[PDB]
Each structure stands twice: as structure tokens, then as C-alpha cells.
């Protein structure tokens, strides 16, 4: 009853499932063999586990224990009459009669041994059969689940703010990166008991081994609490990354309308679509249609119960700015997780239930209908939460909106090679290989200067601009000398604009970003700027800002990491590089050495 199921590769009724597996797969008699004969995976579940049931005997492999009468003996402890639990491609359980096996274990074997280390594992996860990327999703999720519980506990050494601390780290054991990828459960004791207190995330700061904190509970922190980084349990996932496409005809789902504010007459051409389609995808491009496109499916669908997600409290949010504008604050609710990651969003009290528009991350989603539902920064998102998404609504229709030369998932475990756009999870593959549908562009927020920058053979093709060259160009091509926290710091690149452009009288209320976190920092000793980084800088609007790269590494001459960079900007730009052969497709003006003071 818990013990029997559908192989998940065949799916022929089984009472087999592999142990070795974290996920524990049901697995029927001829894919059971096929996979554990040439892995290392040699456990084998049923009601009972396949081992020797002789007291005192250690034997596991399945592929050396017999059947004795009801129960698994080694061929020491083996009864006189018994045969072999392997046999004949086979192992043995119910439904050896029936099941039908599979030409799809070549990958499910590899994906369930990797270690998810490698890009390479990664991609296995999104070129597979459609099955088999629900099991590497969930293999890959438990698995950094699990890794969490390697890193050391932090405890408080001293409050030195509202803001601040310093942590002592257990010794002997690594400690996690800071950041808000990383999410800690806080702790106190009292003399007899431990006693949670909140989450809390972690920042460097400038001077120090002081580091910089928010948290859910405005609980004020004392010396001796400390830190877990918490393991969640990972749920099994059901629904498919993506649903099978319908193409239709006519109009499908809900009713549109004959009213639409005449601004949105130029997407009145891609609402189209989305009633043309069980899914559609848009791209894309920052600055940005997307946010507005989102927001004028509601007005000409005006009946549509619409449930508008992402990954992002950040931008679920954002999208009820852009959205309590044009649409009733009244009829819409906006909802909230286990716990506010810092602050966040919410309605009405008393609750239940929900109707006409919904708000929600997809961690936070409940079981609904839907008429639209809209996927927000799919980019950033995973086939785990694909699935999730897939299964929590029952939709007619799902929009996705995102564009892959923007920023992707954390993956936490990936340390060696790099991902491509194509295989961050079941959309971007479309998107990159069936081109998107509905392109947009239109660029309401950027001038041109850079606008036909990354235009050009740098991710995009054809994009186009509104505003023009109203701006100023750059190009640089020395290098300088790096000191490699364990980020590297280039003071003599950022040296160069010290006291060369400084001349801009008001032109000064300038942001900075740079690639690396050590180098971000000395923007506020030498120069005075305020600063913030790629990973910040999404939908936020500037003017003024600078890049100093690095050696590259072109972990900081990644190509979308360098859009969502570049495109962050309304008045100026400057750009100072390495290069060397990266000013091929960076379209500007060259400038030089002794002529900057
Ligand atoms: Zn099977
Ligand atoms: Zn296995
Ligand atoms: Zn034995």
C-alpha cells in the first residue's frame, strides 16, 4: 500500500522501489535491474528491505541474495531450496508477468548517481523525457537540501546594532557563503530548553568580520544565540514541467472585451495569442513591457480569474505596484508564506477566500483555479517550481513571461563548468530553441547608447530602441593587478576613474556595480559611491553608473550577468574592461592612459 506503485520509468504496477535512491523510486522488475546490474545502487525496498535476514550477516547486494520462502538469505545463509532474487534481467516482486521496461535507463541511472557538481549534470536535467526531469528536479533539490546540513552553526559573538553582528563560526566545519540565497533559522536557550526565534539572512560589511542581518521577527538579538542553516524536506513533484500544448482556433477559456484603455492597443496583437494557446511564452528584454503586458491581460479579459506568480517575493510584489494602479484594489487578494522573508505583503483579514486577481509566490501557492496564470521571472525559476506551479493550478491558459539574458537560479552545488540559458528549466529551452513567442521591444527606460550595444552579437539579435544616443561612450584596454577575501579585489582598475571623469560636476549621484563582492566594497573608501550589485540590481531604475571588470574569469565577462548590468541605467554609462577580444561586439569608442588627469 506504500510499498506498491508505478515504476517511474515504464510505469508498469511494482512492489520494488531502490533504496540507495534518495527519492526511493518505485521501480518495476525490468528497470529495478536494469539499473542496479550496473550502478552502485544495490538496495532494494519492498515491505521489507533485500537483505540477509540471517542475525549476525551483513550482506545488502541484492544481486547476491536468494529468496528463502518469505524472507532473503546470502548464498552462505542460504535454505536448501531458493532462488535468486536476480534472474534473468529481472529482480524479483509482483507483476513480473506484466511489466514492460524501458530504453530510458541509461539516464535515469545517470542522473540518479551524479552529484549535481557539474554542468553537465544539469544538463541531463532538462534534455531528459519529461518524467525523468521530475525525478532529477526532486533528486537535485533534496540533495542541497541535505548538503545544508554540512555547513557549521554560526552563534553570536557580539550585537553591535540594529544591523549588525559578529559571528563566531563552528570550528572544524565549513561555513556557507553570506547571502540571501542562504536563509538561517535563529536560536536561543534558556537554563533548561532551545527555543526558535526567527530567520534571518547575512551580509558582509566594509570594516571587519562584522556582518549585516535582517530578519523576520524584530526579535533583538543576544550574545550566545546562534545559527542553523536549516534542511527542508522536499516534496514529490506530479504535475509536468510543462503541459502539453493545445493550438486553437478561436478563443478559448474566458470572454474578452470591447473596452481596453487605448495604451494598450500595441499588445492587443500578442493577448491574441494567449487565447490562441494552452501556454505561451514572451519575451522578454528589461525595461520592459512585461511588467505592464502582465497587468492588460486582466482589463481585456475583464472576467478572468487571474493568478499572477513568480519565485521573487521581490517581484510578485511588484507586479501589485504596476497593478493597484490600473486594476480594483478591492476585488484582488495578495498572500503570504510560512514566514516573511523580510517584509512583505499582504490583504483583507478574517481571509477566505480569494476570486478575481491573486498574488502569490510559488512556495506560497494553494490549490486553485485559474482562467490565466502568470509566471513572472521564469529565468529565475526551476522545474521544480514548474511542476509546483503546474500542480497547485488548474489553469486554461499560462503565460510566462522572462527573458534568459537576464540572471538564473542559484545553484548552490554547481561549482564547475557553466549553464547556458537553454537548460535553466523546461521554458528557457523553448525560448532558446523554438524562439520565443511573441518577442517585445520597445525600450522605455535606457538610451540608445547601449540599447544597439546589447542589440548586437551579444544575446538578442534584433531589438531596437525609443530614446537615442543621448548619452557618452567608453573604452578602456589596460589591466591591472589583483589581490586574491576569497573574491578578488582590483583597486588599480578601479584606480582609472578616480580622478579622470571625477571632473562631472552634479553628474555624481552615481551608482557602481562591478562584478565581485571585494571590489564592491572599496567603492566606499576610495571614490565614495553608492553601491550595489548585479544580483540587486533588477527592476530598479538609474542613472549614472560605472563597471570595472576584472582579469576575466569570465564569470565576470558572463554575458547575461553583464546585460542585467548594462542595462540598469537611464542617463550614463562607463564601461572599463580587460578585453582583449570582448570589444568586438561592445560597440563604442576606445580611449587611453596618459590622458586622464
Ligand atoms: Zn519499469
Ligand atoms: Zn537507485
Ligand atoms: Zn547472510
Not at 561555513?175 to 551580509?203: A, D, H, M, W
Not at 481585456?300 to 521573487?312: G, K
Not at 504596476?322 to 483583507?348: G, H, M, Q, T
Not at 550614463?572 to 580587460?578: P, V
Request: proline share 5%; with cysteine; charged share 20%.
Amino acid at each position: 500500500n506504500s510499498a506498491v506503485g508505478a515504476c517511474v520509468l515504464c510505469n508498469s504496477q511494482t512492489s520494488l522501489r531502490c533504496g540507495a535512491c534518495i527519492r526511493r523510486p518505485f521501480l518495476c522488475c525490468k528497470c529495478c535491474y536494469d539499473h542496479v546490474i550496473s550502478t552502485s545502487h544495490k538496495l532494494v525496498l519492498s515491505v521489507n528491505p533485500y537483505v540477509c535476514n540471517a542475525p549476525g550477516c551483513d550482506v545488502t547486494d541484492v544481486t547476491q541474495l536468494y529468496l528463502g520462502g518469505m524472507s532473503y538469505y546470502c548464498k552462505s545463509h542460504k535454505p536448501p531450496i531458493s532462488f535468486p532474487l536476480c534472474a534473468n534481467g529481472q529482480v524479483f516482486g509482483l507483476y513480473k508477468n506484466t511489466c514492460v521496461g524501458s530504453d530510458n535507463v541509461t539516464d535515469f541511472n545517470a542522473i540518479a548517481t551524479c552529484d549535481w557538481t557539474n554542468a553537465g549534470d544539469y544538463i541531463l536535467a532538462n534534455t531528459c523525457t519529461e518524467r525523468l526531469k521530475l525525478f532529477a528536479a526532486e533528486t537535485l533539490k533534496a540533495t542541497e537540501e541535505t548538503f545544508k546540513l554540512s555547513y557549521g552553526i554560526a552563534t553570536v559573538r557580539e550585537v553591535l546594532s540594529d544591523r549588525e553582528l559578529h559571528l563566531s563560526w563552528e570550528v572544524g566545519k565549513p561555513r556557507p557563503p553570506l547571502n540571501r540565497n542562504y536563509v538561517f533559522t535563529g536560536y536561543r536557550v534558556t537554563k533548561n530548553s532551545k527555543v526558535q526565534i526567527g530567520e534571518y539572512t547575512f551580509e558582509k560589511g566594509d570594516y571587519g568580520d562584522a556582518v549585516v542581518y535582517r530578519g523576520t521577527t524584530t526579535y533583538k538579538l543576544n550574545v550566545g544565540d546562534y545559527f542553523v542553516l536549516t534542511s527542508h524536506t522536499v516534496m514529490p513533484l506530479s504535475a509536468p514541467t510543462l503541459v502539453p500544448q493545445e493550438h486553437y482556433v478561436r478563443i478559448t477559456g474566458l470572454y474578452p472585451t470591447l473596452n481596453i484603455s487605448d495604451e494598450f492597443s500595441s499588445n492587443v496583437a500578442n493577448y491574441q495569442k494567449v487565447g490562441m494557446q494552452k501556454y505561451s511564452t514572451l519575451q522578454g528584454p528589461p525595461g520592459t513591457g512585461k511588467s505592464h503586458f502582465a497587468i492588460g491581460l486582466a482589463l481585456y479579459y475583464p472576467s478572468a480569474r487571474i493568478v499572477y506568480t513568480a519565485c521573487s517575493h521581490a517581484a510578485v510584489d511588484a507586479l501589485c505596484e504596476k497593478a493597484l494602479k490600473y486594476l480594483p484594489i478591492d476585488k484582488c487578494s495578495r498572500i503570504i508564506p510560512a514566514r516573511a522573508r523580510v517584509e512583505c505583503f499582504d490583504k483583507f483579514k478574517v481571509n477566505s477566500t480569494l476570486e478575481q486577481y491573486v498574488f502569490c509566490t510559488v512556495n506560497a501557492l494553494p490549490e486553485t483555479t485559474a482562467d490565466i496564470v502568470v509566471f513572472d521571472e521564469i529565468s529565475m525559476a526551476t522545474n521544480y517550481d514548474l511542476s509546483v506551479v503546474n500542480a497547485r493550478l488548474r489553469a486554461k491558459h499560462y503565460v510566462y513571461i522572462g527573458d534568459p539574458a537576464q540572471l538564473p537560479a542559484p545553484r548552490t552545488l554547481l561549482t564547475k563548468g557553466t549553464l547556458e540559458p537553454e537548460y535553466f528549466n523546461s521554458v528557457c529551452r523553448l525560448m532558446k530553441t523554438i524562439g520565443p513567442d511573441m518577442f517585445l521591444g520597445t525600450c522605455r527606460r535606457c538610451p540608445a547608447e547601449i540599447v544597439d550595444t546589447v542589440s548586437a552579437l551579444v544575446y538578442d539579435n534584433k531589438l531596437k530602441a525609443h530614446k537615442d544616443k543621448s548619452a557618452q561612450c567608453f573604452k578602456m584596454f589596460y589591466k591591472g593587478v589583483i589581490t586574491h577575501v576569497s573574491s578578488a579585489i582590483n583597486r588599480p582598475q578601479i584606480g582609472v576613474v578616480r580622478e579622470f571623469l571625477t571632473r562631472n560636476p552634479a553628474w555624481r549621484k552615481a551608482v557602481f556595480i562591478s562584478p565581485y563582492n571585494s571590489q564592491n566594497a572599496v567603492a566606499s573608501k576610495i571614490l565614495g559611491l553608492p553601491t550595489q550589485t548585479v544580483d540587486s540590481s533588477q527592476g530598479s531604475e538609474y542613472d549614472y553608473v560605472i563597471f570595472t571588470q576584472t582579469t576575466e574569469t569570465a564569470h565576470s565577462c558572463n554575458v547575461n550577468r553583464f546585460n542585467v548590468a548594462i542595462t540598469r541605467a537611464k542617463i550614463g554609462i562607463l564601461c572599463i574592461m580587460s578585453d582583449r577580444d570582448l570589444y568586438d561586439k561592445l560597440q563604442f569608442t576606445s580611449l587611453e592612459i596618459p590622458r586622464r588627469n
